[PDB]
Amino acid sequence: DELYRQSLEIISRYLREQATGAKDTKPMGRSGATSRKALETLRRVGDGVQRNHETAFQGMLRKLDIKNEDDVKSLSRVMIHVFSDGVTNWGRIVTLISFGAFVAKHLKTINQESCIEPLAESITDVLVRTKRDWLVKQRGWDGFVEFFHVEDLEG
Numbered sequence: 147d148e149l150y151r152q153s154l155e156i157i158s159r160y161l162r163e164q165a166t167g168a169k170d171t172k173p174m175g176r177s178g179a180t181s182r183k184a185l186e187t188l189r190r191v192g193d194g195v196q197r198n199h200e201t202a203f204q205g206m207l208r209k210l211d212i213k214n215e216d217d218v219k220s221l222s223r224v225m226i227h228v229f230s231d232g233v234t235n236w237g238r239i240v241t242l243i244s245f246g247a248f249v250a251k252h253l254k255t256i257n258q259e260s261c262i263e264p265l266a267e268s269i270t271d272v273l274v275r276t277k278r279d280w281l282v283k284q285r286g287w288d289g290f291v292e293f294f295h296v297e298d299l300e301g
């Protein structure tokens with residue numbers, strides 16, 4: 147399942163990088179060029195989402211009250227409720243992953259870094275297993291990179 151594997155790699159790297167503030171220097175697996183570009187795109191667009199919706203992000207984090215492994219496990223149901231049960235577009239996918247990064251940073255701050263990888267898996271499961279048809283129709287991570295591509299300015 148190449149789409150699942152690629153998705154998990156991109157999402158896991160972004161969440162870990164957000165939490166630690168350090169780039170992972172290990173090579174990507176399969177489809178490395180696209181995955182690198184996808185991660186670069188999340189760095190740009192995801193960071194903006196977290197700031198544009200800072201108050202709402204903080205509010206939801208507070209409401210969720212994430213302390214430990216069991217709370218992190220409980221998030222799948224919430225993601226299905228909020229993300230899966232609605233329209234699908236790249237913006238909503240970016241928000242799913244960006245709020246994930248916001249939770250990952252919280253996990254670092256409460257010294258529960260071990261829960262970041264399970265969190266990344268949960269987000270990937272929700273995205274790929276509930277929206278595969280859409281993702282395939284939209285050309286997967288190549289489509290993601292194409293959708294957010296910015297042309298160079300003249301001059």
Ligand SMILES: CN1CC/C=C/[C@H](O)[C@@H]2CC[C@H]2CN2C[C@@]3(CCCc4cc(Cl)ccc43)COc3ccc(cc32)[C@@](O)(C(=O)O)CC1=O
Binds near residue numbers: 202229237238241
């Ligand atoms: C205009 N916006 C962005 C501002 C809305 C902020 C919301 O109050 C709340 C703060 C987090 C967001 C709720 N979640 C966050 C949520 C749902 C809460 C649990 C959760 C946990 C993780 Cl690890 C990742 C994501 C999520 C599901 O992902 C979302 C995707 C799309 C939208 C909202 C999502 C979103 O698409 C939606 O609200 O439907 C976001 C949207 O329209």
